[PDB]
Amino acid sequence: KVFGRCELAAAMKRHGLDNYRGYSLGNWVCAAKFESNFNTQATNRNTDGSTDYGILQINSRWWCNDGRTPGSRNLCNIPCSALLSSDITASVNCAKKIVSDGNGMNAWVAWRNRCKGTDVQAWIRGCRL
Ligand SMILES: [Cl-]
Numbered sequence: 001k002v003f004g005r006c007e008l009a010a011a012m013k014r015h016g017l018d019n020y021r022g023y024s025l026g027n028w029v030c031a032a033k034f035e036s037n038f039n040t041q042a043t044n045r046n047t048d049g050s051t052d053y054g055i056l057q058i059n060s061r062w063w064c065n066d067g068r069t070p071g072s073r074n075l076c077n078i079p080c081s082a083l084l085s086s087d088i089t090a091s092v093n094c095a096k097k098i099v100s101d102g103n104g105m106n107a108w109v110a111w112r113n114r115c116k117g118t119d120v121q122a123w124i125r126g127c128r129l
């Protein structure tokens, strides 16, 4: 599923992301825009052989099991394919674990390079929230 910007913002708010660990909703929407273009079915393979999955491009090296990343962890306790669902619940629950991990949203390279220090509230402007 390809989300609309405001559709995703509302789904994220409902799942408890607005101000989760101090990151306002605009940050999560911005990160999703640049990670996956709001497409839950986004996959991208990394040089190390790991793969990123879903709307927040969560990586199989640490966070999920895809059966092909030798010597990886499954810290969110899910098959990576659960991250591609049109229901963002698994992606959101796993993102909460990631952002608590010490580096905050800097774990998402596109957030750090494209969202951090920008006016992220623009991403939720005009939405009925
Ligand atoms: Cl932080």
Ligand code: NA
Binding pocket: 024, 025, 026, 027, 120, 121, 124
């Ligand atoms: Na915001």
Ligand code: NA
Binding pocket: 065, 066, 067, 068, 069, 070, 071, 072
């Ligand atoms: Na594996």
